[PDB]
Amino acid sequence: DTEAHVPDVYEEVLGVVPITTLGPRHYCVILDPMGPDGKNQLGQKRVVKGEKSFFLQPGERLERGIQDVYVLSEQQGLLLKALQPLEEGESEEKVSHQAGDCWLIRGPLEYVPSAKVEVVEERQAIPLDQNEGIYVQDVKTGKVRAVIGSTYMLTQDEVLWEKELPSGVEELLNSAPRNKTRVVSYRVPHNAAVQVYDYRAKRARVVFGPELVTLDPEEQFTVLSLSAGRPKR
Amino acid sequence: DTEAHVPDVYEEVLGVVPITTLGPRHYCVILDPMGPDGKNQLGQKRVVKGEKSFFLQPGERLERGIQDVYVLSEQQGLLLKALQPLEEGESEEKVSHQAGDCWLIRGPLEYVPSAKVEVVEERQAIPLDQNEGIYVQDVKTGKVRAVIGSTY
Amino acid sequence: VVSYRVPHNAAVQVYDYRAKRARVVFGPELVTLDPEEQFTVLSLSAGRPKR
């Protein structure tokens, strides 16, 4: 229709404008969304995602206005998400997560956060040179390892792990704030050797030659207090 | 209905807002929660979880407003709780607990403290390197040991 | 847990007091002290004239 207001002195509340969602990239959450009862589901929430013309029924509101679909950072773009309530085979994974048991989805997909899922970290995978790396610690295991060589994204249970020696920082930068999670590595000069001891593994290693060494999570550089002066201090 | 006020000069106390609890995460405790009597259960307390529209009956009141369901810190998020009165097979574990005899539930689960329970510690497990740890003391034993290697 | 990187050419002495376990740890390895055990300490001479 296009019907006359005050059909019998009735309150025009407003002319409501239809929220419309951009096919190729738009979604949203409506709160108090009415199911069959024609009346609001007060606590609940509904996500709608495609191209749609949408009228917010009375007592519906939009949670976060008009959010656009996550389309990942791709080769390396990551979302990490917990889950408010328990739910199985519900997400676009058709796999079971227990309430809270958070996880990550990455790769070449577009994501709409499910009703029951919450986007924790918008993770970004770190590009790594053939010969450089980062330390990760497994929150779950406690396991602190060095990931070196290729670019990496930290698995759901991982996070970056820092370290450094009390003076070694200076002979290394031989400054910008030294990044404590980037794998410590040092170019051993042509006619030199450096003595490294792994402390967690109890692996001694003396690396000679012109090669570079990189220190595994626990291992330390041996330092040397050498004399030098014209009068030799 | 939508009934006319003062049906025969009667006192409206107020319009009561329908306290509503969020399905995925909200719960709460009502105090003086009237049961079958149609009349308040004065000393007591009713817990209510899940999605619900609620109208607090006259002489009800929410103990702690509109609290939200615990869902743990997960691989490593912990809740330690004591109990007011004794209760057996009453926990969601269907496990017997003696009054006071406090205990913890951790892991990947969402929790609502039972009417007869109270959340002692919101414990959080410590991440520990392959080669470092902490000293825990067993209050029961008095035993003090070294817990080293993993997260605890 | 108290731990200590024993330097390459050193050894530290530790005694466990609760268990009565003596231990001298050599090498470049690191020691971590159990609840009761203690580091033997040393009061050494140092100066040019040797205090």
CSV table of C-alpha atoms in Angstrom, one decimal:
chain,number,residue,atom,x,y,z
A,1,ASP,CA,0.0,0.0,0.0
A,2,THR,CA,0.9,3.7,0.5
A,3,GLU,CA,-1.6,4.2,3.4
A,4,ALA,CA,-2.9,7.4,5.2
A,5,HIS,CA,-1.3,8.0,8.6
A,6,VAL,CA,-3.6,8.2,11.7
A,7,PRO,CA,-5.8,5.5,10.3
A,8,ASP,CA,-7.7,6.5,13.4
A,9,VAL,CA,-5.4,8.9,15.3
A,10,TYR,CA,-2.5,6.4,15.2
A,11,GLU,CA,1.1,7.3,16.2
A,12,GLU,CA,3.5,7.5,13.3
A,13,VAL,CA,6.7,6.6,15.0
A,14,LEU,CA,8.9,7.4,12.0
A,15,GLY,CA,9.5,6.7,8.3
A,16,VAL,CA,12.0,3.9,8.7
A,17,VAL,CA,14.8,3.6,6.1
A,18,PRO,CA,15.7,0.1,4.9
A,19,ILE,CA,19.2,-1.1,5.9
A,20,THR,CA,20.6,-2.7,2.7
A,21,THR,CA,23.6,-5.0,2.6
A,22,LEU,CA,26.3,-4.9,-0.2
A,23,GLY,CA,26.3,-8.3,-1.9
A,24,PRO,CA,30.1,-8.6,-2.5
A,25,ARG,CA,31.2,-7.5,1.0
A,26,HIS,CA,28.5,-6.5,3.6
A,27,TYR,CA,27.0,-8.2,6.6
A,28,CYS,CA,25.6,-7.3,10.1
A,29,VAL,CA,24.1,-8.4,13.4
A,30,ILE,CA,20.5,-7.4,14.3
A,31,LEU,CA,19.6,-7.5,18.0
A,32,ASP,CA,16.3,-8.5,19.5
A,33,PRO,CA,15.5,-10.1,16.1
A,34,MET,CA,12.0,-11.5,15.8
A,35,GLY,CA,11.5,-15.1,14.8
A,36,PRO,CA,8.1,-16.6,14.1
A,37,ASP,CA,6.4,-15.0,17.1
A,38,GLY,CA,6.5,-11.7,15.2
A,39,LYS,CA,7.8,-10.3,18.4
A,40,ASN,CA,11.4,-9.7,19.4
A,41,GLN,CA,13.7,-12.4,20.7
A,42,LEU,CA,15.0,-9.8,23.3
A,43,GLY,CA,18.3,-11.4,24.3
A,44,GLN,CA,19.2,-13.0,21.0
A,45,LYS,CA,20.9,-11.8,17.8
A,46,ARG,CA,20.7,-12.7,14.0
A,47,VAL,CA,23.5,-12.3,11.4
A,48,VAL,CA,22.5,-11.6,7.8
A,49,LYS,CA,25.1,-11.5,5.1
A,50,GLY,CA,24.3,-11.5,1.3
A,51,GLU,CA,22.9,-8.8,-0.9
A,52,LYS,CA,19.6,-7.9,0.8
A,53,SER,CA,17.2,-5.1,1.2
A,54,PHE,CA,16.3,-5.2,4.9
A,55,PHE,CA,13.7,-3.5,7.0
A,56,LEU,CA,14.4,-3.4,10.7
A,57,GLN,CA,11.2,-4.6,12.2
A,58,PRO,CA,10.0,-2.8,15.3
A,59,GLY,CA,12.4,-3.2,18.3
A,60,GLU,CA,15.2,-4.5,16.1
A,61,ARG,CA,18.6,-2.6,16.2
A,62,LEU,CA,21.9,-3.2,14.4
A,63,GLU,CA,24.6,-4.3,16.7
A,64,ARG,CA,27.6,-2.8,14.7
A,65,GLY,CA,25.8,-0.8,12.1
A,66,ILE,CA,26.8,-2.3,8.8
A,67,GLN,CA,30.0,-4.3,9.1
A,68,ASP,CA,31.7,-5.6,5.9
A,69,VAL,CA,32.6,-9.3,5.4
A,70,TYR,CA,36.0,-10.4,6.6
A,71,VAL,CA,38.0,-11.2,3.5
A,72,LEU,CA,41.3,-12.5,4.8
A,73,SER,CA,44.8,-11.1,4.3
A,74,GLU,CA,44.9,-14.2,2.2
A,75,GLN,CA,48.2,-15.8,1.4
A,76,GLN,CA,48.8,-14.6,4.9
A,77,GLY,CA,45.8,-13.1,6.7
A,78,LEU,CA,44.4,-14.7,9.8
A,79,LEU,CA,41.5,-14.5,12.2
A,80,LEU,CA,41.6,-16.1,15.6
A,81,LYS,CA,38.4,-16.5,17.5
A,82,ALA,CA,36.9,-17.8,20.7
A,83,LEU,CA,33.3,-18.9,21.1
A,84,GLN,CA,30.8,-17.5,23.7
A,85,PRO,CA,28.6,-20.7,23.7
A,86,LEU,CA,29.4,-24.4,23.0
A,87,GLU,CA,28.5,-25.3,19.3
A,88,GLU,CA,29.3,-28.2,17.0
A,89,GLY,CA,29.5,-28.5,13.2
A,90,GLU,CA,27.9,-25.0,13.2
A,91,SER,CA,30.6,-22.8,11.7
A,92,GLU,CA,31.8,-22.9,8.0
A,93,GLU,CA,34.2,-25.7,9.2
A,94,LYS,CA,31.5,-28.2,10.2
A,95,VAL,CA,33.8,-29.1,13.1
A,96,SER,CA,33.2,-29.0,16.8
A,97,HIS,CA,34.5,-26.4,19.3
A,98,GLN,CA,33.8,-26.3,23.0
A,99,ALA,CA,32.7,-23.0,24.5
A,100,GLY,CA,35.8,-20.8,24.6
A,101,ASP,CA,38.1,-23.3,23.0
A,102,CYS,CA,39.4,-20.6,20.6
A,103,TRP,CA,41.0,-21.3,17.3
A,104,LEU,CA,42.2,-19.7,14.0
A,105,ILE,CA,41.1,-19.7,10.4
A,106,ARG,CA,43.5,-18.3,7.8
A,107,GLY,CA,44.1,-18.6,4.0
A,108,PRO,CA,42.2,-17.5,0.9
A,109,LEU,CA,38.6,-17.3,2.4
A,110,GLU,CA,36.0,-14.7,3.3
A,111,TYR,CA,34.6,-15.0,6.8
A,112,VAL,CA,31.4,-13.8,8.6
A,113,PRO,CA,31.8,-14.1,12.3
A,114,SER,CA,29.1,-16.6,13.3
A,115,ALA,CA,26.4,-15.6,15.8
A,116,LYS,CA,28.2,-17.5,18.6
A,117,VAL,CA,31.9,-16.7,17.6
A,118,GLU,CA,34.0,-13.7,18.5
A,119,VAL,CA,37.0,-12.4,16.5
A,120,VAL,CA,39.9,-12.2,19.0
A,121,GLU,CA,43.0,-11.4,16.9
A,122,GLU,CA,43.1,-10.3,13.3
A,123,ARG,CA,46.4,-12.1,12.9
A,124,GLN,CA,49.0,-11.2,10.3
A,125,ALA,CA,51.6,-13.7,9.2
A,126,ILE,CA,55.2,-12.6,9.5
A,127,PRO,CA,57.4,-12.7,6.3
A,128,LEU,CA,60.7,-14.3,6.9
A,129,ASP,CA,64.0,-14.2,5.0
A,130,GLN,CA,65.5,-17.6,4.0
A,131,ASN,CA,67.8,-17.1,7.0
A,132,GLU,CA,65.9,-15.1,9.6
A,133,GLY,CA,63.2,-16.1,12.0
A,134,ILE,CA,61.1,-15.5,15.2
A,135,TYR,CA,60.6,-17.3,18.5
A,136,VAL,CA,57.2,-18.6,19.3
A,137,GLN,CA,56.0,-19.9,22.6
A,138,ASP,CA,53.1,-22.4,22.8
A,139,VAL,CA,50.8,-21.0,25.4
A,140,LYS,CA,49.4,-24.5,25.8
A,141,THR,CA,52.7,-26.4,26.1
A,142,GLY,CA,55.0,-23.6,27.3
A,143,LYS,CA,57.2,-24.8,24.5
A,144,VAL,CA,59.4,-22.0,23.2
A,145,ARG,CA,61.0,-22.7,19.9
A,146,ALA,CA,62.6,-20.7,17.1
A,147,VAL,CA,60.8,-20.6,13.7
A,148,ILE,CA,63.3,-19.7,11.1
A,149,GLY,CA,63.6,-19.5,7.3
A,150,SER,CA,60.1,-19.2,5.7
A,151,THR,CA,57.3,-16.7,6.5
A,152,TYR,CA,55.1,-17.9,9.3
A,153,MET,CA,51.7,-17.5,10.9
A,154,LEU,CA,51.5,-18.5,14.5
A,155,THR,CA,49.1,-21.4,15.1
A,156,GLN,CA,46.1,-20.8,17.3
A,157,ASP,CA,48.0,-21.8,20.4
A,158,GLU,CA,51.2,-19.8,19.7
A,159,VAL,CA,52.5,-16.4,20.5
A,160,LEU,CA,55.8,-14.5,20.0
A,161,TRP,CA,58.5,-15.0,22.6
A,162,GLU,CA,61.2,-12.5,23.5
A,163,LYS,CA,64.7,-13.0,25.0
A,164,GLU,CA,68.2,-11.3,25.4
A,165,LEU,CA,71.6,-11.3,27.2
A,166,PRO,CA,72.6,-8.5,29.7
A,167,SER,CA,75.4,-7.0,27.5
A,168,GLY,CA,75.3,-9.0,24.3
A,169,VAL,CA,72.9,-6.5,22.8
A,170,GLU,CA,75.7,-4.1,22.0
A,171,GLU,CA,78.3,-6.4,20.4
A,172,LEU,CA,75.4,-7.7,18.3
A,173,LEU,CA,74.4,-4.2,17.0
A,174,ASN,CA,78.0,-4.1,15.8
A,175,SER,CA,70.6,1.7,17.4
A,176,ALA,CA,66.9,1.1,16.8
A,177,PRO,CA,64.9,-0.6,19.6
A,178,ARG,CA,66.2,-4.1,19.4
A,179,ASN,CA,63.3,-6.5,18.7
A,180,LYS,CA,63.3,-9.1,21.4
A,181,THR,CA,61.4,-11.8,19.4
A,182,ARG,CA,63.4,-11.8,16.2
A,183,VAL,CA,65.8,-14.8,16.3
A,184,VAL,CA,69.2,-13.7,17.6
A,185,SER,CA,71.8,-14.2,14.9
A,186,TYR,CA,75.4,-13.1,14.5
A,187,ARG,CA,77.8,-13.0,11.6
A,188,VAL,CA,81.0,-14.8,12.8
A,189,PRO,CA,83.8,-13.0,11.0
A,190,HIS,CA,86.1,-15.0,8.6
A,191,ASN,CA,88.9,-15.7,11.1
A,192,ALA,CA,86.8,-16.1,14.2
A,193,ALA,CA,84.9,-18.6,16.3
A,194,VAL,CA,82.1,-18.0,18.7
A,195,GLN,CA,81.3,-20.4,21.6
A,196,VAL,CA,77.6,-21.0,22.1
A,197,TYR,CA,76.1,-23.2,24.8
A,198,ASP,CA,72.5,-24.4,24.6
A,199,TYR,CA,71.1,-24.2,28.1
A,200,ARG,CA,67.8,-26.1,27.8
A,201,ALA,CA,69.4,-28.9,25.8
A,202,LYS,CA,72.9,-28.9,27.3
A,203,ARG,CA,74.3,-28.8,23.8
A,204,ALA,CA,77.7,-27.1,23.6
A,205,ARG,CA,78.6,-25.8,20.1
A,206,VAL,CA,81.6,-23.8,18.9
A,207,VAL,CA,80.9,-22.5,15.4
A,208,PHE,CA,84.0,-21.4,13.4
A,209,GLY,CA,84.6,-20.0,10.0
A,210,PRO,CA,82.8,-17.2,8.3
A,211,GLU,CA,79.3,-18.6,8.9
A,212,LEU,CA,76.6,-17.0,10.9
A,213,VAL,CA,75.1,-18.5,14.1
A,214,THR,CA,71.6,-18.1,15.4
A,215,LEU,CA,70.7,-18.8,19.0
A,216,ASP,CA,68.0,-21.3,19.9
A,217,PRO,CA,65.4,-20.1,22.5
A,218,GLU,CA,67.8,-20.9,25.5
A,219,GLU,CA,71.3,-20.9,24.2
A,220,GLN,CA,73.8,-18.2,25.0
A,221,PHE,CA,76.8,-16.5,23.6
A,222,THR,CA,80.0,-16.9,25.4
A,223,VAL,CA,81.4,-13.4,26.0
A,224,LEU,CA,85.1,-12.5,26.3
A,225,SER,CA,86.8,-10.0,28.6
A,226,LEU,CA,90.0,-9.2,26.6
A,227,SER,CA,92.9,-6.8,27.2
A,228,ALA,CA,93.6,-4.2,24.5
A,229,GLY,CA,95.6,-1.0,25.4
A,230,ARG,CA,99.0,0.4,24.5
A,231,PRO,CA,99.7,-0.2,28.1
A,232,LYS,CA,97.7,-3.5,28.0
A,233,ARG,CA,94.8,-3.1,30.5
B,1,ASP,CA,-4.4,-7.0,28.9
B,2,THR,CA,-3.5,-3.4,28.8
B,3,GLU,CA,-5.4,-2.4,32.0
B,4,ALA,CA,-6.7,1.0,33.2
B,5,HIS,CA,-4.9,2.3,36.3
B,6,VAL,CA,-6.7,2.6,39.7
B,7,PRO,CA,-9.2,-0.2,38.9
B,8,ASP,CA,-10.9,1.2,42.0
B,9,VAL,CA,-8.3,3.7,43.3
B,10,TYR,CA,-5.3,1.2,43.3
B,11,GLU,CA,-1.7,2.1,43.7
B,12,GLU,CA,0.6,1.7,40.8
B,13,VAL,CA,4.1,1.2,42.2
B,14,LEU,CA,5.8,1.5,38.7
B,15,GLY,CA,6.2,0.1,35.2
B,16,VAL,CA,8.6,-2.8,35.7
B,17,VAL,CA,11.3,-3.2,33.0
B,18,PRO,CA,11.5,-6.8,31.8
B,19,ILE,CA,15.0,-7.9,32.8
B,20,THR,CA,16.3,-9.9,29.9
B,21,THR,CA,19.2,-12.4,29.8
B,22,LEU,CA,21.5,-12.8,26.8
B,23,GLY,CA,21.3,-16.4,25.5
B,24,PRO,CA,25.0,-17.0,24.6
B,25,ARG,CA,26.4,-15.3,27.8
B,26,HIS,CA,24.1,-13.9,30.4
B,27,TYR,CA,22.7,-15.4,33.7
B,28,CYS,CA,21.7,-14.1,37.1
B,29,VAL,CA,20.5,-14.6,40.7
B,30,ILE,CA,17.1,-13.3,41.9
B,31,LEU,CA,16.6,-12.9,45.6
B,32,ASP,CA,13.4,-13.6,47.5
B,33,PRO,CA,12.4,-15.7,44.4
B,34,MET,CA,8.7,-16.6,44.8
B,35,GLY,CA,7.9,-20.1,44.0
B,36,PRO,CA,4.6,-22.0,44.0
B,37,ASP,CA,3.2,-19.9,46.9
B,38,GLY,CA,2.6,-16.9,44.6
B,39,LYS,CA,4.4,-15.4,47.6
B,40,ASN,CA,8.2,-14.7,48.0
B,41,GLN,CA,10.6,-17.3,49.2
B,42,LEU,CA,12.3,-14.7,51.5
B,43,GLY,CA,15.7,-16.0,52.5
B,44,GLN,CA,16.4,-17.8,49.3
B,45,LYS,CA,17.9,-17.3,45.8
B,46,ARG,CA,17.0,-18.6,42.3
B,47,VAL,CA,19.6,-18.7,39.6
B,48,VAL,CA,18.6,-18.3,35.9
B,49,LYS,CA,20.7,-18.8,32.8
B,50,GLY,CA,20.3,-19.0,29.0
B,51,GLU,CA,18.1,-16.8,26.9
B,52,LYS,CA,15.1,-15.5,28.9
B,53,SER,CA,12.8,-12.6,29.0
B,54,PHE,CA,12.1,-12.1,32.7
B,55,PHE,CA,9.7,-10.0,34.7
B,56,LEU,CA,10.9,-9.8,38.3
B,57,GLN,CA,7.9,-10.6,40.4
B,58,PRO,CA,6.8,-8.2,43.2
B,59,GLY,CA,9.4,-8.5,46.0
B,60,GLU,CA,12.0,-10.1,43.8
B,61,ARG,CA,15.4,-8.3,43.2
B,62,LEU,CA,18.5,-9.2,41.3
B,63,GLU,CA,21.4,-10.2,43.5
B,64,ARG,CA,24.1,-8.9,41.2
B,65,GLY,CA,22.3,-7.1,38.4
B,66,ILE,CA,22.6,-9.1,35.2
B,67,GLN,CA,25.9,-11.1,35.4
B,68,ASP,CA,27.4,-13.0,32.5
B,69,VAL,CA,28.1,-16.7,32.2
B,70,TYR,CA,31.6,-17.7,32.9
B,71,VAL,CA,33.2,-19.4,30.0
B,72,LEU,CA,36.7,-20.4,31.1
B,73,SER,CA,40.1,-19.0,30.0
B,74,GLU,CA,40.1,-22.4,28.3
B,75,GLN,CA,43.2,-24.6,27.7
B,76,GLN,CA,44.3,-22.6,30.8
B,77,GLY,CA,41.6,-20.7,32.5
B,78,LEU,CA,40.5,-21.8,35.9
B,79,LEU,CA,37.7,-21.3,38.5
B,80,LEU,CA,38.2,-22.3,42.2
B,81,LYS,CA,35.1,-22.4,44.3
B,82,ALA,CA,33.9,-23.2,47.8
B,83,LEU,CA,30.3,-24.0,48.8
B,84,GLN,CA,28.0,-22.5,51.3
B,85,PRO,CA,26.0,-25.7,52.2
B,86,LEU,CA,26.7,-29.4,51.6
B,87,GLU,CA,25.5,-30.8,48.2
B,88,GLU,CA,25.9,-34.2,46.5
B,89,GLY,CA,25.6,-35.1,42.7
B,90,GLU,CA,24.3,-31.5,42.5
B,91,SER,CA,27.2,-30.1,40.4
B,92,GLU,CA,27.2,-30.4,36.6
B,93,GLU,CA,29.9,-32.9,37.2
B,94,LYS,CA,27.3,-34.9,39.2
B,95,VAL,CA,29.9,-35.0,41.9
B,96,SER,CA,29.5,-34.9,45.7
B,97,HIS,CA,30.8,-31.9,47.7
B,98,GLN,CA,30.9,-31.4,51.4
B,99,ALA,CA,30.2,-27.9,52.8
B,100,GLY,CA,33.3,-25.7,52.5
B,101,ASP,CA,35.3,-28.5,50.8
B,102,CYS,CA,36.4,-26.2,48.0
B,103,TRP,CA,37.5,-27.3,44.5
B,104,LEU,CA,38.4,-26.1,41.0
B,105,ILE,CA,37.0,-26.6,37.5
B,106,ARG,CA,39.1,-25.5,34.5
B,107,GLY,CA,39.4,-26.5,30.8
B,108,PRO,CA,37.3,-25.6,27.8
B,109,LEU,CA,33.9,-25.2,29.5
B,110,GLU,CA,31.3,-22.4,30.3
B,111,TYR,CA,30.1,-22.2,33.9
B,112,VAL,CA,27.3,-20.8,36.1
B,113,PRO,CA,27.9,-20.9,39.8
B,114,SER,CA,25.3,-23.0,41.5
B,115,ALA,CA,23.0,-21.4,44.0
B,116,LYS,CA,25.0,-23.2,46.7
B,117,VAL,CA,28.5,-22.3,45.4
B,118,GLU,CA,30.7,-19.1,45.3
B,119,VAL,CA,33.6,-18.3,43.0
B,120,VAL,CA,36.7,-18.2,45.2
B,121,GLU,CA,39.6,-17.7,42.8
B,122,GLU,CA,39.5,-16.8,39.1
B,123,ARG,CA,42.7,-18.8,38.5
B,124,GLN,CA,44.9,-18.5,35.4
B,125,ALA,CA,47.6,-21.1,34.6
B,126,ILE,CA,51.2,-19.9,34.2
B,127,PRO,CA,53.0,-20.4,30.9
B,128,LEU,CA,56.4,-21.8,31.6
B,129,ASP,CA,59.4,-22.4,29.3
B,130,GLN,CA,60.8,-25.9,28.8
B,131,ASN,CA,63.4,-24.9,31.3
B,132,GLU,CA,61.8,-22.8,34.0
B,133,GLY,CA,59.0,-23.0,36.6
B,134,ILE,CA,57.5,-22.1,39.9
B,135,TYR,CA,57.3,-23.5,43.5
B,136,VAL,CA,53.9,-24.6,44.6
B,137,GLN,CA,53.0,-25.3,48.2
B,138,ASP,CA,50.3,-27.8,48.9
B,139,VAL,CA,48.3,-26.2,51.7
B,140,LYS,CA,46.9,-29.7,52.5
B,141,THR,CA,50.3,-31.5,52.6
B,142,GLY,CA,52.5,-28.4,53.4
B,143,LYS,CA,54.6,-30.0,50.6
B,144,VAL,CA,56.6,-27.4,48.7
B,145,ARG,CA,57.8,-28.7,45.3
B,146,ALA,CA,59.4,-27.4,42.1
B,147,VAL,CA,57.1,-27.5,39.1
B,148,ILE,CA,59.3,-26.8,36.1
B,149,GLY,CA,59.3,-27.5,32.4
B,150,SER,CA,55.8,-26.9,31.1
B,151,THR,CA,52.9,-24.5,31.7
B,152,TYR,CA,51.0,-25.1,35.0
C,1,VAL,CA,62.2,-21.3,40.4
C,2,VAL,CA,65.7,-19.8,41.1
C,3,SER,CA,68.0,-20.8,38.3
C,4,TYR,CA,71.6,-19.9,37.4
C,5,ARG,CA,73.8,-20.2,34.3
C,6,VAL,CA,77.0,-21.8,35.5
C,7,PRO,CA,79.6,-20.2,33.2
C,8,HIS,CA,81.7,-22.5,30.9
C,9,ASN,CA,84.7,-22.9,33.1
C,10,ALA,CA,83.1,-23.0,36.5
C,11,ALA,CA,81.2,-25.1,38.9
C,12,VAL,CA,78.7,-24.2,41.6
C,13,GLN,CA,78.2,-26.1,44.8
C,14,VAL,CA,74.6,-26.7,46.0
C,15,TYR,CA,73.3,-28.6,48.9
C,16,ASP,CA,69.7,-29.7,49.3
C,17,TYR,CA,68.7,-29.0,52.9
C,18,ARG,CA,65.3,-30.8,53.0
C,19,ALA,CA,66.5,-34.0,51.3
C,20,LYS,CA,70.2,-33.8,52.4
C,21,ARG,CA,71.4,-34.1,48.7
C,22,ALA,CA,74.8,-32.5,48.1
C,23,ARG,CA,75.6,-31.6,44.5
C,24,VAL,CA,78.5,-29.9,42.7
C,25,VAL,CA,77.4,-28.9,39.2
C,26,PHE,CA,80.2,-28.4,36.7
C,27,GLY,CA,80.4,-27.4,33.1
C,28,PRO,CA,78.6,-24.7,31.2
C,29,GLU,CA,75.2,-26.1,32.3
C,30,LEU,CA,72.6,-24.2,34.3
C,31,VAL,CA,71.3,-25.0,37.8
C,32,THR,CA,67.9,-24.5,39.2
C,33,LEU,CA,67.4,-24.7,43.0
C,34,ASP,CA,64.9,-27.0,44.5
C,35,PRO,CA,62.5,-25.6,47.3
C,36,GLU,CA,65.1,-25.9,50.0
C,37,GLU,CA,68.6,-26.3,48.4
C,38,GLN,CA,71.1,-23.4,48.6
C,39,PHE,CA,74.0,-22.0,46.6
C,40,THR,CA,77.3,-22.3,48.3
C,41,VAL,CA,78.8,-18.8,48.1
C,42,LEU,CA,82.5,-17.9,48.1
C,43,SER,CA,84.3,-15.0,49.8
C,44,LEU,CA,87.3,-14.5,47.6
C,45,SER,CA,90.2,-12.1,47.5
C,46,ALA,CA,90.3,-9.5,44.7
C,47,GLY,CA,92.5,-6.4,45.0
C,48,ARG,CA,95.8,-5.4,43.5
C,49,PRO,CA,97.1,-5.6,46.9
C,50,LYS,CA,95.0,-8.8,47.6
C,51,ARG,CA,92.3,-7.9,50.1
